[PDB]
């Protein structure tokens, strides 16, 4: 499974763009004009799908606010869509990486059936893919110096 | 060239479907019509199924959900599938949801190509499609289900 490549795709086309907006703009502005100088990114790696009725975050996501962030990238204007949540005077860009949704589907809907008695072994392999994804995401953030803008959190560590 | 995700999908979806087809002598429609020559068409998409510019964005809602019951190692079990009856043939049709993360990368992330690496990333991700197909075919042949199943990469059709 291409976990490191999926982490690079996700970082370079979502996470870094978001960081570049936060840095260039001095935070994310709410629609009323309120700028949040304390704008950070929270990346949560879920176990089950967020839409699963037995998921921790099945309701949280409805509280998010969609924003279109504009930023400059190598001198050219670009934009990206993020989901935000304000807490304690701080703005959080929150994302469950959809590039992992295939494994989330395996965890919610296929592994619990365990027809061939191998689900424990399979599930260990898939969780190691989540570990390599998180590892690569942190290394890329550190490479670019965005490690204080980004927290990556595995659901198992909640 | 093996995929664990393919093995999970095969063992918990494809093989259950095949065991119903074999045990039932085909899949029955709601009117009771039994389609003896019931087959499975597994389509490996490039874009998401919901993507507005995907071949199969429209096809999907023409399908009818069916609960297949079957016996597995002495216990009664079931699996839910989506069927299409066309020209006297019943096809179980599935876009493996275990591949949706790669479909999301291909539809929603790679076209932005911020760092001009999308072409290389896309070659690497397509490797996962090839390994998925290889694994499904190998497991289907192992179990003698290879004539029940057709695995189609979008790149080939």
Chain A contact set for B135 (CB, 8 A)? none
**Full DSSP string of A66-86:** EEEEEEEETTEEEEEEEEEEE
> Tokens in use for A83?
């989901």
Q: What domain count does chain B have?
A: 1
A-chain residue closest to B130, CA distance: A1
**How far apart, in Å, are the Cα atoms of A61 and each of A109, A146, A157, B54?**
21, 24, 19, 27
DSSP state of A116: T
Q: Among A6, A12, A105, whose Cβ lies nearest the Cβ of B100? A: A105
Q: A53-58 long-range contacts, Cβ below 8 Å, gap at least 24?
A: A56/A155, A56/A158, A57/A96
The method of structure determination was: X-ray
Taking an 8 Å cut-off on Cβ atoms, the answer to whether A106 and B77 are in contact is: no
Measured from the Cβ of residue B50, the count of other Cβ atoms closer than 10 Å reads: 12
B-chain residue closest to A104, CA distance: B98
Distance CA A150, CA A37 (A): 15
Chain B contact set for A125 (CB, 8 A)? 4
Crossing angle, helix B15-24 and helix B118-143, to 10 degrees? 30
Taking an 8 Å cut-off on Cβ atoms, the answer to whether B109 and A5 are in contact is: no
Taking an 8 Å cut-off on Cβ atoms, the answer to whether A14 and B97 are in contact is: no
Task: Return the SS3 of B28.
Answer: strand
CB pairs under 8 A between A and B: 106
List the end-to-end C-alpha distance of chain A, in Å, as a whole number.
25
Distance CA B8, CA B154 (A): 21
Q: Tokens 């057709």 map to which residue?
A: B150
Q: Following CA atoms A54, A57, A63, A66 in sequence, which dihedral angle do they give, to the nearest 10 degrees?
A: -120
Distance CA B27, CA A2 (A): 36
Q: Of A59, A67, A73, A82, which is closest to residue A32 (Cα–Cα)? A: A67
**How far apart, in Å, are the Cα atoms of A50 and each of A38, A58, A79, A113, B54?**
26, 5, 25, 19, 24
Distance CA B123, CA A10 (A): 16
Taking an 8 Å cut-off on Cβ atoms, the answer to whether A5 and B100 are in contact is: no
Taking an 8 Å cut-off on Cβ atoms, the answer to whether A9 and B105 are in contact is: yes
Chain A contact set for B6 (CB, 8 A)? none
Taking an 8 Å cut-off on Cβ atoms, the answer to whether B11 and A115 are in contact is: yes
Distance in Å, alpha carbon of A46 to nearest chain B alpha carbon: 13
Chosen from B3, B8, B130 to mutate, greatest number of chain A CBs within 10 A: B8
* Structural domain containing residue B135: 4-156
């Amino acid at each position: 499974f291409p976990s490191s490549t999926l982490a690079a795709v996700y970082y370079e086309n979502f996470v870094k763009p978001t960081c570049l907006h936060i840095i260039q703009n001095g935070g994310i502005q709410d629609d009323d004009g309120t700028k949040y100088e304390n704008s950070t990114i929270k990346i949560i790696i879920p176990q089950k799908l967020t839409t699963d009725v037995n998921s921790q975050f099945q309701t949280l996501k409805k509280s998010f606010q969609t924003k279109k962030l504009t930023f400059d990238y190598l001198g050219r204007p670009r934009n990206i869509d993020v989901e935000t949540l304000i807490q304690d005077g701080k703005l959080y860009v929150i994302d469950f990486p959809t590039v992992l949704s295939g494994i989330n589907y395996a965890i919610s809907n296929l592994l619990p059936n365990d027809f061939n008695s191998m689900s424990d072994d399979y599930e260990l392999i898939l969780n190691r893919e989540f570990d390599r994804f998180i590892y690569t995401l942190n290394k890329l953030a550190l490479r670019d110096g965005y490690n204080n803008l980004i927290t990556v959190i595995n659901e198992k560590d909640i």
